[PDB]
């Protein structure tokens, strides 16, 4: 399989950006494989 990268833009903070999403407080466990699961 050909896995390749392509440039997609500059990394820049946008002034006056759209704000969205809440700020959830969650209890989670991280296993040795990198899985996060809710407790």
């Amino acid at each position: 399989v050909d896995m390749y990268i392509e440039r997609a833009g500059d990394i820049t903070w946008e002034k006056d950006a759209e704000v969205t999403g809440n700020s959830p407080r969650l209890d989670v466990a991280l296993d040795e494989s990198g899985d996060f699961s809710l407790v």
Binding site: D2, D10, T12, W13, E18, L26, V28, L30
Partner: protein, 154 residues
């Protein structure tokens, strides 16, 4: 290896699929392990070899050690620079929540994008990359919350 954000693509005999995103900084490519499974990448005519990685953190760097050292300050709003499949990069600002774990708190963003957005950078107000998007959980209503996953610059 010019600095910037990149799509990670796969192709066989037909068209291409965007499997993720990553950050080129200081000559090193940074993405999430689940995007590449820790395998080599092509960049134009060149090959990028895995250098550092950690499946528990779900991170991998190419060409050199992990370079992204900025940390979420635990207080301020952040921006996801989302690079979704088939769409140009867009900035989304949010106040992170928190993944509380037995080993400490991790900032987390309640922003939901396609799987191939994995690896998109999360930024502080100075434009520094404070982590990568895409290792998270699905909450009761089916929506998504991603850790702000950051490595260690040794």
């Amino acid at each position: 290896t010019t600095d910037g954000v990149y799509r990670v693509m796969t192709r066989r005999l037909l068209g291409s699929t965007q499997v993720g995103v990553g950050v080129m900084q200081e000559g090193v490519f940074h993405t999430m392990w689940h995007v590449t499974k820790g395998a080599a990448l092509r960049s134009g005519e060149g090959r990028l070899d895995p250098y550092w990685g950690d499946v528990k953190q779900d991170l991998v760097s190419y060409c050199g050690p992990w370079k992204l050292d900025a940390a979420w300050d635990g207080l301020s709003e952040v921006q996801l620079l989302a690079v979704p499949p088939g769409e140009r990069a867009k900035n989304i600002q949010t106040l992170p929540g928190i993944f509380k774990t037995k080993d400490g708190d991790i900032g987390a963003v309640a922003l939901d994008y396609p799987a191939g957005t994995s690896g998109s950078p999360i930024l502080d107000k100075c434009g520094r990359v404070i982590g990568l998007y895409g290792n998270g959980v699905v909450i009761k209503n089916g929506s998504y919350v991603s850790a702000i996953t950051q490595g260690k610059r040794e």
